[PDB]
Amino acid sequence: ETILEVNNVPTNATSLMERLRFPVSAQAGKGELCAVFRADPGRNGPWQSTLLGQLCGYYTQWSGSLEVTFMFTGSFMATGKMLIAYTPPGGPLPKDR
Amino acid sequence: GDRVADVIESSIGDSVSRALTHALPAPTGQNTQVSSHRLDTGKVPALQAAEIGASSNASDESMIETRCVLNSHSTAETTLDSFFSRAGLVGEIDLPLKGTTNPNGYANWDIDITGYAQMRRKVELFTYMRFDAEFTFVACTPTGEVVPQLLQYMFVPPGAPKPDSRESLAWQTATNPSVFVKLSDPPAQVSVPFMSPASAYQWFYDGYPTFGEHKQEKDLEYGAMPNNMMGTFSVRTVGTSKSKYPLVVRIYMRMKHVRAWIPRPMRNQNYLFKANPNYAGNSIKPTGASRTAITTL
Amino acid sequence: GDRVADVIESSIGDSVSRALTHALPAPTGQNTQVSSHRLDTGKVPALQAAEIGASSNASDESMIETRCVLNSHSTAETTLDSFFSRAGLVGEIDLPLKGTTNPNGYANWDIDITGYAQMRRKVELFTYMRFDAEFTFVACTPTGEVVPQLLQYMFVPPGAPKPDSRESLAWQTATNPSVFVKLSDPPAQVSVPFMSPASAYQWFYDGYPTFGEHKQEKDLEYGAMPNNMMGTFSVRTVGTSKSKYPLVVRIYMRMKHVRAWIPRPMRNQNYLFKANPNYAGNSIKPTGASRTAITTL
Amino acid sequence: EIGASSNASDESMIETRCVLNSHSTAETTLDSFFSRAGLVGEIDLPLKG
Amino acid sequence: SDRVAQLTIGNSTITTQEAANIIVGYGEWPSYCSDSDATAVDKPTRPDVSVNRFYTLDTKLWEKSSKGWYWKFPDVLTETGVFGQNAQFHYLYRSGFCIHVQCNASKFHQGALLVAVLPEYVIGTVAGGTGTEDTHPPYKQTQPGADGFELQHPYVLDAGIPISQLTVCPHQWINLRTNNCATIIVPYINALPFDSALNHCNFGLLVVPISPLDYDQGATPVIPITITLAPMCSEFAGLRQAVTQ
Amino acid sequence: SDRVAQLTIGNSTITTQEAANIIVGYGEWPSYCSDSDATAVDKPTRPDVSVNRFYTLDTKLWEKSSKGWYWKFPDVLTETGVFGQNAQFHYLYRSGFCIHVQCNASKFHQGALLVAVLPEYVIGTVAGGTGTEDTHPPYKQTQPGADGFELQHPYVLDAGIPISQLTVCPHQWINLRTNNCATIIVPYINALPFDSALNHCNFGLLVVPISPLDYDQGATPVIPITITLAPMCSEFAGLRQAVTQ
Amino acid sequence: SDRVAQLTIGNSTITTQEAANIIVGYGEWPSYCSDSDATAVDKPTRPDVSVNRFYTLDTKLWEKSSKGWYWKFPDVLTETGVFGQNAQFHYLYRSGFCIHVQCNASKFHQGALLVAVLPEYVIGTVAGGTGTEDTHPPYKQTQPGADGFELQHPYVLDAGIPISQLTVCPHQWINLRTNNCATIIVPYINALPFDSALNHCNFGLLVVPISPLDYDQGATPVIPITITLAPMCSEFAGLRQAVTQ
Amino acid sequence: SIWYQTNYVVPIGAPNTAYIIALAAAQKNFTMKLCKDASDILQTGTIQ
Numbered sequence A: 001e002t003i004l005e006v007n008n009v010p011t012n013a014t015s016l017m018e019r020l021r022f023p024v025s026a027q028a029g030k031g032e033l034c035a036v037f038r039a040d041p042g043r044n045g046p047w048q049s050t051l052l053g054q055l056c057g058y059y060t061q062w063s064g065s066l067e068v069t070f071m072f073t074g075s076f077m078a079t080g081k082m083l084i085a086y087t088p089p090g091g092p093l094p095k096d097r
Numbered sequence B, C: 001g002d003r004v005a006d007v008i009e010s011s012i013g014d015s016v017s018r019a020l021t022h023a024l025p026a027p028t029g030q031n032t033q034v035s036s037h038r039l040d041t042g043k044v045p046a047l048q049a050a051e052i053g054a055s056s057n058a059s060d061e062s063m064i065e066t067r068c069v070l071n072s073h074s075t076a077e078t079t080l081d082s083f084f085s086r087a088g089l090v091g092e093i094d095l096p097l098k099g100t101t102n103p104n105g106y107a108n109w110d111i112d113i114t115g116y117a118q119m120r121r122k123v124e125l126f127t128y129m130r131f132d133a134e135f136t137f138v139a140c141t142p143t144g145e146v147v148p149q150l151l152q153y154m155f156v157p158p159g160a161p162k163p164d165s166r167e168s169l170a171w172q173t174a175t176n177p178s179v180f181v182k183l184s185d186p187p188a189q190v191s192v193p194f195m196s197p198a199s200a201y202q203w204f205y206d207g208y209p210t211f212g213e214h215k216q217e218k219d220l221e222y223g224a225m226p227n228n229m230m231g232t233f234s235v236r237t238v239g240t241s242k243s244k245y246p247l248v249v250r251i252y253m254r255m256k257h258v259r260a261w262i263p264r265p266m267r268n269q270n271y272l273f274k275a276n277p278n279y280a281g282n283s284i285k286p287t288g289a290s291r292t293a294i295t296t297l
Numbered sequence D: 001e002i003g004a005s006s007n008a009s010d011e012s013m014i015e016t017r018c019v020l021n022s023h024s025t026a027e028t029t030l031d032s033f034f035s036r037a038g039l040v041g042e043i044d045l046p047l048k049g
Numbered sequence E, F, G: 001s002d003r004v005a006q007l008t009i010g011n012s013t014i015t016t017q018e019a020a021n022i023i024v025g026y027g028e029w030p031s032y033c034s035d036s037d038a039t040a041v042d043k044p045t046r047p048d049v050s051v052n053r054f055y056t057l058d059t060k061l062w063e064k065s066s067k068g069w070y071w072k073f074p075d076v077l078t079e080t081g082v083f084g085q086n087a088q089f090h091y092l093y094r095s096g097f098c099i100h101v102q103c104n105a106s107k108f109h110q111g112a113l114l115v116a117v118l119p120e121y122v123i124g125t126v127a128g129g130t131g132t133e134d135t136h137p138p139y140k141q142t143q144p145g146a147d148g149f150e151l152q153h154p155y156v157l158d159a160g161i162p163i164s165q166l167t168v169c170p171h172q173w174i175n176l177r178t179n180n181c182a183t184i185i186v187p188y189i190n191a192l193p194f195d196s197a198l199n200h201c202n203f204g205l206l207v208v209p210i211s212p213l214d215y216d217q218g219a220t221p222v223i224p225i226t227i228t229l230a231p232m233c234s235e236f237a238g239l240r241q242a243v244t245q
Numbered sequence H: 001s002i003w004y005q006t007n008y009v010v011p012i013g014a015p016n017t018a019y020i021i022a023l024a025a026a027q028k029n030f031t032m033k034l035c036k037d038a039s040d041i042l043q044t045g046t047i048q
């Protein structure tokens, strides 16, 4: 496992490190979207930061399952429950939870 | 575990393809057996019912009196490899000095064998085909002259960077396969494996490659099968300065280790465009020749 | 047959109810065993976690020092038949001489035992009940006097014609069961089987009997279970002329061969209507008694 | 935090069928990856220069 | 080891690190209908993974003044996913359910919810207040769908029965200092082998605060309660066109 | 005994008293996908009776001037019944089909229809007539749904290939003096183990009059052709929300 | 039992009550050089306890704005204790290392450090900014000694390579809500059996905040990161006078 | 896609925002084929 840049938005050199982590915070309500990304490992985007993504670049075809492990780095006193979903081909970006 | 009877006596999940027919060896044409006259009621081999969907099962022996003929005529030349393992032209690339097309000493050809009719009509006899191939590259000037020029051929699979100049960094070819050959050498020749992500290439794909609305603007993608898109064949003269000679590269393909499935009717109208069956609606011609009347030759 | 592994290792169709618990014989109250002092770490029977959903498993022996008590106290009186096989009033029919109600010497009572609170509260302790029943009919005048009058009781199952007069042809009772008895005879009494189309009668049915839009006009059918609708009990004085006496028929039911499933909280508000749990919103009372403070009796 | 990669597999996260995988791992050996000739040097021998 | 748990069914997995065991209603796991209990003769359809999976249907906000809510089964799901479609195209249906109620707060918040399953949960009305009117609950109240419905009089469960005795039903508590979820497995409960998913709700799910939510000003004030459930051993029969009511 | 037949699958039964046997395309019955041909790892769903049953989808009128029609599979069914729902909720699909084409007339009517199944039936355009324009067929023509579509140039099958050779494909004829139906069983045909029911039509069904319909004035002039079909061994995988395109 | 740990080597013992296991780099424990891998013929000296022991070398302050630091091995220790003396008096040296990085905060603080070992950590320069100047890093930057050095551009690790892939190297994380230390055992890594402790750094230790340090005003704001390390299986050869460079 | 199932909850005194780090890799059934050059070439002019 290598770090996936889900937060691949900031581009100025002094904010590049921010690409390595994304946030969560107290929401005021219900079923809010936190983040989204394509699962395609050899496509431009978040996966380019991973060694998998890079090695993928030297091969035309691939096959297999992938896995993304999310580590929470808030304080010990913080709690929460998140729903992480994988939408197979054909399903458009989910509008709601 | 399963306790209800219907789950126990279920055929859900049966993965065995039950076949009604089987292949038999047949190295020669069938022989003819002696037959005699038959004047019998009830038995009637001449009468058929084409509606069933089968071909007639009547043979020479049951329709006329036959002698015995021992037939040694071979069936070997009609195997798929006999039919297809013959090299035919599938591509032509021009590298002129002055021009509109590939004028800068390099060219990128997307691999598609449907640009030439002889070859295209043969492969389209089937729906699916799986095979390996031998590619031969014949290069010379437009008059067929052989000049002292060095060329580089590079196979660029989908996703690899396509060169955009005779000096592109992509020609470093550290992973893609490249062939360096002189026009004065015999034609370059290599073996290519079966490369599709699918189990076979398919000359016909009745569908779309992506989901979504299929608005007229994106109807040029109907029938587009990415599984047949093997990449680009790129060629260049090897130099930082322009070549002194105008060049032509002819590409020949020879299939080998061929398997084919689902035969279909053969093309009877001229081809107009690559990978698409459009035909000229104003010039629909009969499949073959005509005559003036059904009662005269 | 099934060839794919997932079909073979499937539990689809398992009809065996896997039970985590089992009944044990228990004819007497549990005994008490001698216990002594325990001054130990790690072991802690007094501490619980009610969140789990289970009741405490701590016993007398583990909380105080106990002596041995051999308990012979029987558990027989708390079986369902002991509790329910006692006859209680479930219906009352008036046959007056002058009046608004049943003034013509006959009456039709739809069988429903929810009109009387003592009985209704006991059966509603459970959701489903299956049982046979013994019905006793006590008849007399409104003062409790016994007069020389002949009556006819007829059970009219759903779909059988309900009498509409003391002289209805339906009283021919050629198939329905009827009881002819005199008020001077002891109370009539009969045995009735479990008659529902369902496996049990259910005092609570969270649904509608029919499909369709459920517009406010037909909301009186919410919770209506035809499976509990056993028909009509019809009674008449046996004559073409009016009876000389005003009569009252009291109906008692005694369940027997009882089975019950799914216990529920017991009714804590007065009943208002038959077969429906409406309660007076302006008079919601605490389940039991109150006191002025939590620190004094 | 331990430093290891996740040990969770498809089978323990969703209900899976049986798949017999014949896909080869031969093309990702070091020789498959590296035994392909690439340009590493260029030398010019001009007339004037 | 009683506190950590993973529930996986279909293409869905739920995790919890503050559980309080699992309740199996009436000590019986769900099962398919036997050939001797069955009566309908057509071969049923048992879709399996496409219908027996977790569906997260709704989130409520727990407030210091919340009364409590209820949902009806299978009503909550009749319009969701492949399960909904089957419930609509078929006259007969039966299944068990795995219910997972979620609610996390912090070690400084407090409160306790009673999470219970009450079979045949018939709703009553206040009878015009005086108790003289035989009024009836409207459809949106007896079958509220995925939104659930708020209790008007939790003490008598809007049905004239004491919530103090609701624990005689399969249940768990979500007491914030202890756990953040409740998991209840319910077998199919009915007096018939199969029934209509539309006309009949086999049971109701009740989530009622018994010890009110509390915390000091400054601590996250939005404390959601999310309901996730999965049908188990679903069977459908009596196929025809799709019907919603 | 070759002429009488009964086809029963699911809750549906078809009868015919003037059949001409049954064709099993490419001499192979439909089957489920094996564990070695499969690639996708999720456990598929196989609904069985609720999707493998006969659906009567359309009726056409055979007229003395009819050109012929085609339907695409599984397109014809993606919006019908429980099958449609599954095809919409799942990315992957595969199944075989039993096709039963119906057409009865009288012993005084005449004509012959060719009923054939052509795998990967790619439609072409007339290229602007002159053949200089690279135009493409629109969606309603490549996937006509249950209505089917009428052939513009039957002789070249709207694809530049001779209908005279269409018999190299699984087929039967409905020759009125002989039979009143055609029955073809088709196994799943594709170069992949499963595929999208929406983006890809595995085969097209062609019903083309080759010997035109005729009868004397006074005989019933309305001669319908009805299409009834049943998916066989349907499997679905890759579940998510419902999608129609 | 994965969280509590005691490391004892030489006359030194380290304890931790919030550990996250131990990483053994490349799954191989340190060992002495075999007679077949060796080339130098003099009998080595293996001081044992006086050099293989824990040395606490430095403390850094983690601030909300910290970029990260690195240390080079064996550079950090060449001037410390009996180990330093041996590294100076001998031409040849080899050893493995047990690295223990320490950082405790409170249950109300948060943040995550990536602690990794990168063999042959060659430092690059920004090439005059425009990238046209072939400038080189100075000695104090390539071998910073016990003080370590602060990263100028952590994202590319001051060497044109992505820190996002640094986890392909032996590492642990110090995520404050979970643990307060990282322990990595590194075997001797080199393409030669012994080498100069002065001219060559076999690997660099990187301590980089990836999830920034945070806490509310009023909580202890000084959060140190202390580095303690122990050489393992140290061997020295090629004795002469002491040399520092 | 990542959604809030309930909510991020914290007591008085703990930060209101926290971060998640994602780590990705392939499973054991993962294989690749048809070796090709990567889309990027990390040099502009000649490397000196």
Ligand SMILES: CCCCCCCCCCCCC/C=C\[C@H](O)[C@H](N)CO
Pocket: B111, B112, B113, B114, B133, B135, B153, B154, B155, B177, B178, B179, B190, B192, B195, B201, B202, B203, B228, B229, B230, B233, B275
């Ligand atoms: C160094 C020179 C190597 C040249 C590499 C040639 C690779 C050719 C692979 C054979 C591909 C078969 C043709 C496949 C598809 C058809 O052309 C069309 N796309 C069908 O629409």
Ligand SMILES: CCCCCCCCCCCCC/C=C\[C@H](O)[C@H](N)CO
Pocket: C111, C112, C113, C114, C133, C135, C153, C154, C155, C177, C178, C179, C190, C192, C195, C201, C202, C203, C228, C229, C230, C233, C275
């Ligand atoms: C000749 C006299 C025969 C009298 C026949 C009496 C038959 C009574 C059958 C017992 C029925 C049990 C009560 C069933 C349902 C409840 O009363 C309500 N409908 C519940 O809503």
Ligand SMILES: [Cl-]
Pocket: A040, A041, A042, A043
């Ligand atoms: Cl990809």
Ligand SMILES: [K+]
Pocket: B028, B029, B030, B031, B070, B071, B072
């Ligand atoms: K022969």
Ligand SMILES: [K+]
Pocket: C028, C029, C030, C031, C070, C071, C072
């Ligand atoms: K006893």
Ligand SMILES: [K+]
Pocket: D020, D021, D022
């Ligand atoms: K394998």
Ligand code: NA
Pocket: B044, B045, B046, B047, B048
């Ligand atoms: Na014959």
Ligand code: NA
Pocket: C044, C045, C046, C047, C048
């Ligand atoms: Na205990």
